Design a protein around this ligand. Sequence first.
Ligand SMILES: [Fe+2]
Ligand SMILES: [Fe+3]
Ligand SMILES: [Fe+3]
Lengths: 391, 391, 167, 130, 130, 515, 140
Amino acid sequence: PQSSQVTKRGLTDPERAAIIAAAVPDHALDTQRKYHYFIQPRWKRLSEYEQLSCYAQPNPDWIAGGLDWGDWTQKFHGGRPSWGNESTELRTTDWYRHRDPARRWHHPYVKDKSEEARYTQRFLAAYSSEGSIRTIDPYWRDEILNKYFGALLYSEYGLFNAHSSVGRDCLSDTIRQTAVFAALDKVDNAQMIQMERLFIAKLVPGFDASTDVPKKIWTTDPIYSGARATVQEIWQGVQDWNEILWAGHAVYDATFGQFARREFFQRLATVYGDTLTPFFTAQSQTYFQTTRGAIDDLFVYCLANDSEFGAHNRTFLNAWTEHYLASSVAALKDFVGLYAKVEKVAGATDRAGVSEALQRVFGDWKIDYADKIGFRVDVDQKVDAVLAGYK
Amino acid sequence: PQSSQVTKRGLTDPERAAIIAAAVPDHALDTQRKYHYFIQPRWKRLSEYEQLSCYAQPNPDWIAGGLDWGDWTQKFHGGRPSWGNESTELRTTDWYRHRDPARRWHHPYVKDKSEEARYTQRFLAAYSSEGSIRTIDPYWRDEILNKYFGALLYSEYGLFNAHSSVGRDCLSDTIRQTAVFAALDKVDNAQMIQMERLFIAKLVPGFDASTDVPKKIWTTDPIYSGARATVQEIWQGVQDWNEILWAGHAVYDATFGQFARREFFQRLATVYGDTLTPFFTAQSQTYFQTTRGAIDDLFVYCLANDSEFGAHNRTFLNAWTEHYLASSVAALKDFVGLYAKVEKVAGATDRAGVSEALQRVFGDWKIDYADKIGFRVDVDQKVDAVLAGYK
Amino acid sequence: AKREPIHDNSIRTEWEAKIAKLTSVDQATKFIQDFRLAYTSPFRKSYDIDVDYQYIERKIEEKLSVLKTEKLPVADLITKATTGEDAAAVEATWIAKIKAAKSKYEAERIHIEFRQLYKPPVLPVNVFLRTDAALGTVLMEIRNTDYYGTPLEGLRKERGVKVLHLQ
Amino acid sequence: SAHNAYNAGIMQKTGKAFADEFFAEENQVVHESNAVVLVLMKSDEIDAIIEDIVLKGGKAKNPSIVVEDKAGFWWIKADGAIEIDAAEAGELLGKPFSVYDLLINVSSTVGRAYTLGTKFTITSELMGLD
Amino acid sequence: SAHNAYNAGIMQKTGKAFADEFFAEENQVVHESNAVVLVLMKSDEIDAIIEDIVLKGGKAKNPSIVVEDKAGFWWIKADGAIEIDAAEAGELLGKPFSVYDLLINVSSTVGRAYTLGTKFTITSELMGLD
Amino acid sequence: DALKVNRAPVGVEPQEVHKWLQSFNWDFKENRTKYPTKYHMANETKEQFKVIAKEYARMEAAKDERQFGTLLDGLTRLGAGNKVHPRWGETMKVISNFLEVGEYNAIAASAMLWDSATAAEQKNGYLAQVLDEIRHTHQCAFINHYYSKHYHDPAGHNDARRTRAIGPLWKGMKRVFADGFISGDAVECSVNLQLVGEACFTNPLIVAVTEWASANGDEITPTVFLSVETDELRHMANGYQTVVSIANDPASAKFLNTDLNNAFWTQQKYFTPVLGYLFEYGSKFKVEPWVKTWNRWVYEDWGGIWIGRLGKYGVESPASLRDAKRDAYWAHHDLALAAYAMWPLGFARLALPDEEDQAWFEANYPGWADHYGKIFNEWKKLGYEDPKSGFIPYQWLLANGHDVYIDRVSQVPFIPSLAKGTGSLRVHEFNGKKHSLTDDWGERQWLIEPERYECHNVFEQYEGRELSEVIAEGHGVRSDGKTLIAQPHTRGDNLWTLEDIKRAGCVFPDPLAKF
Amino acid sequence: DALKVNRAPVGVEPQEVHKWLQSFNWDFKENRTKYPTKYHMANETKEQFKVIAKEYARMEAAKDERQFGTLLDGLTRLGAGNKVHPRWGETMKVISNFLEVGEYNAIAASAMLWDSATAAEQKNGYLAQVLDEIRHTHQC
Ligand SMILES: [Fe+2]
Ligand SMILES: [Fe+3]
Ligand SMILES: [Fe+3]
């Protein structure tokens, strides 16, 4: 016996359901049942991803693409609009144009990451039972992986916080979903790196999983000097939300981020008997490739080729790319000094093997990004600049 | 319209819902709401795994543990019962005693494997886009991995078909689920290997993913001669369903299987720059430890320590282990001739490396299975027996 | 006749005491075959313990099996029947027997009797099951030959039943 | 197309009328039927496939298709064959939808069923014998 | 526990009587409440937690707990704090049930809420100021 | 190269792996089935729904999430568990747990097909079938687990895996879709389990019942059963492939018509009357006459689309069909007489047909009123529902010469003095044991294969024992130790107790002793 | 050692990672919020629901599967979409869509709290809130 009323349900209560059925007409009052039918579809047909995302942001007509009208209801002191064209140097005819090629709305994004979340714990319970850690090279495990791969977590964490202003400032819904999903994948990468260090600490006595040494290395070791500087600038030096996304993902994470994760820690792990690290980098690489598809569509399909502002946008992207490629080339030059600490393996850690690694990162980037915005780059020159840091 | 009645739903139709509500008593007719409350819980409280599984098999009292009575309604020609004690040498006071420690009924088992199924495809899409196969050792890839890791899928397929009679003959529900789950994971291992081979074919022109060379190696190459003999025996030479589960998972797969999958193809992958194979062995290894937990409970907790038949059961387990360990030692003896083909890596493919790998497999096997059934095993003796096949 | 309770009755108690006097493999083998020849199959010698013989037989199996692991050498568990016969010999003996049967009624008897005599733990399980399958294959083919050819009245005579009532 | 109604033929009779045809001599052996029966489990995806595939395009190619409302599922009977392309359903629903995602709510099949490419098919043909 | 009913105090009155108290002078500023309000989404897991955790062990320790049925959710109000141990819910439900699995159906909180170990706790305490 | 590779995003689709599955098998001398079989023809078929292990799991997992979402979240928030009519809620105790044993045996039966198949694709396919039948076991289990938590009478839902041993209806369930599958020729399982069990009877048993549950307020069963049958289309396909091999080989085709007829009669002998009874008598609202549900799904559709189509390839219409249609009209009314009369041995609360049920019964089955309606009405006037009446119909049946017999083969009860279904009592004595057979198909099976059919029946086991002693030994009580699970009414007051059963003085006889 | 190692089954729990979350931030001169604020005090707080990215997705994916099972399977089979009183069905046009824009703005407002936060636990916590509001937008 409760004080309030037990509310009868219109779906099942016989009296209310009868009243409801009597009131519902015996015919549809319109035949258009495609939710937000008026969205221009990017693909052969309109997708649930687009129906649920597109035009959620209430932009007015004075923000290119907006279907509304009038000024904002409330603005910052001084008059900064809730969302405004002043937020980025880049221009387009329609900020809604962007489409994640993965078509991630919230549900599929967490559905996928939950599969990875649950499978990882299963893999670790089995990996501990397997004792597979016994064949890992101890110097690699203790002096390179534990110290400098753990230091790398701060680059990922720094890229993650670079999105904080992007998530507030950017000007369309699909762009905002791309940025925020990209940001979670970056803090995940940082958390996942620390998870692995915690995991190894349970299997190897004396393996110190504390972040003190990694942090000391990230903040003071010349190996990460240029990397920290680029990250601190991308994250806190600029607020152009397009510049952050471009410099962070298309320049820094595509060159330094790719060389560190794929060419160094993942690749060398399969040269030093590390059966564990490739399980973790497999996730950071999958996240990178998924982020890149969305970043690519924003800056290539939409921005660099916008019918009216493509050449205008390419001017800023080329200026940005010139600047942050310098900061990344400097970050790599500092990074390749870590090869002086690793035991030399033929074709992997010698001068020839580092060059083939550098040629891969700069070569892939020229195809994936530079060719698409008109940025010219001599790959051999970039390799030689970094290799000047090899000893 | 339609010829038949659009029958009205009793849950929402006002008239039928009113009739129903009038006939449903305003009070419960019993207070026991725990489905199959009389199951004896293995753990602190009865688990949903146990509630849905235990006593599904309609066993009579003359099969140890049964709650039913009488003879079966229909038996084989000659009189073989639907299920009977004649199906295995092992004895117990209660065949229902077994409990998968992972507590897998059908739904959690496919939920967990669905994750691996979807994540794998995302990982493969990213890995191909990464171009990470470029750093792999071409000889390892084409002459060892393609041919010999491919040939190993027949060992897994063999161990999968070993369960067909097991799924028909075993005498309780939790054992049957343990068996069937163990088998699906094994054909999965066989399928995952061929999936990796088909994937590399898409990345490396000239890389042949046909099973012809793997099949020719499995069926004629002396490297797998001992392994194929043991598998053909476990699969088709015996019908004691307890002997199949024991010889398959606790002896052969725990020694030869563990060495081929973990000490060879997964360990050497991380020594020849293979960033792809460890992603697939990470799954078979997880499958192995999850199968081991269930297998370990059936034979150690339930059978080797049954209050009346423990010592009786150890007698048969000892004889089986003696027989099938010799088969697996000979299988490993033929298998270590493969090290003659691989490129020499210090501490991995030399005699000291193979010895340490053999010590790990037999050392782990003594602890995990032998010591629990009273089987004596000179680990040094087994290691030197296999090392005799190393050039 | 009034039945005692299903799972605990004086009849089962009495045979369990009878079973506990078995102290050798040869004694338990003679005891289990005499039991199976007298109380199992449609050609059993008595139905006096119909509702109990299956449980009792299980307890006989449990006694003989324990005796085997206590007393027999390991090789005998794998390759010989508790009668001392060579297990492989028993398989060929009985396969060729039922294959030489001239009717489903000779065939069904040979197969039934094989089970009565050599059902585990007498014969090793692996040898028993594949022999039981071979016999069952032959019995099944001869029975499913012209299955509906003999009318019921003839099938009753051929089976040798006494017809007590036909509605 | 009335012959493929759930209540076609004898199913329409009641009482003695039904009993007389049911026990009629000619109706004591099975009669070869050229039809198929496909049961679709009601859900958001299936109710969209039923209206916009089976009853639009599907019934255009095969006028004999009969779809009946059985509360929890759809009862479909048609002469010859019924086909459903998972690709066409995926475009209709705006989300990935392979053949196995189609099979999520395909309950029963009275006929020969198979999957070729992206297409589920239930056919009256006897593959291997015809 | 009458003060923690959904229709306690002014909520009992109707018409002019409710209006007279609603616009009363004393009732134009907030009044400090030592209570907490928990909202649980009605599901299979939550209906069991309500009946065997909140209303048994929870109400024994805190007799001021009031649970009200609101069609789709449970409305719980109690003095001081309400705690639900997910480990106790796991035993009760017989399936894995971490504290984040409890939060699947813990909708709203009026109070300070946190997770300490396997326990979810909503409390009227002001951590950081008290 | 070390610098140049195609970086287009690719994976490996399921059918790319499945294309190579046939090559996973290899030839050795011992690569043959372990189980006896008459069918030795070549059976190198292709699995119709090409499934790999990962894809199997992704597909089935997707079904579960939608199913358990509906049950655990939505229908629970609606309180749908207690919105079922009592008659139907009681019926689901029997239907679900009985089907569960069939799914459980179907695991094993599918394993034999797995063992006895030769093509690597069909081994991989039948393992998936084996997985499915485990899924089906846990699904049926989940219905009763769900009813136990949310339905107003958890007794019977909560403990059927032991309280089903008490009564005679459970015995025949151990054959129809259980022993009949797994205790015989392994390749014949493609005929009994698949061509007949799965292609014919799962449709009315698992799909058609969904509409009856919806009519009676049960939205739990459709949520689960409709998801169960989505696995069966893959099973029918796999089974049909083997049947093609048998019909195309003259040596093994001469065993096909007989096994089909035995399989069809084996399964219909029980399924027809028992499911008919549970549908028409265990419901308040009826969808359609059971005999029309049977005519639609069994005679016309399965008979025509499967057996009639195959008729062009030697497959005959089953010789037991005429007898089976007669059972479809009347046998479940016969079965109702026995089920109502022996209600204390069950685990469900039954409801005598009320005045409007009787009108319906007599309208669709003319004659029902004078034959069955009069008996049911007389039982009500004798106190059938009143626990103080000291009346239970089984004793009444013996007083009026309506003796009840158990078929030695099918375990189906038979009351020859009241039965209108197919049947006649044949009582044989053989080797000192009396046997009662009930039809020409079961008797022929027993006369030719007596060592296969030695099942003890309830009278042989309970002989001379008082009814309430049997019930209490078999745990047929609620939690208070004295009130029966089974009841002869579906109200909430005046439930029968053990002492109420003892007052009636019912003791089990030897029905064959008079012969 | 290459032969001896603890082979007990272990993983790493959410709270074990989240313990080290505060150390993920480091000091530099420009490490402050980019937005205007009147509040320049120490906000070195703890997140009361220790959340990491993998666990955030697992928890929300679990909510989603039950919600979409109910909608796409259960309620659709019951036709509940047209069992709403017309008055209320119309009201949901504006309630759900107006709530949508409030959820959409909450994405951005959380991102401001993300940027203005100084503790790594609250920076991480506010990104979880940013994703929650994207979830709520697609839910509305
Ligand atoms: Fe929100
Ligand atoms: Fe099934
Ligand atoms: Fe099936």
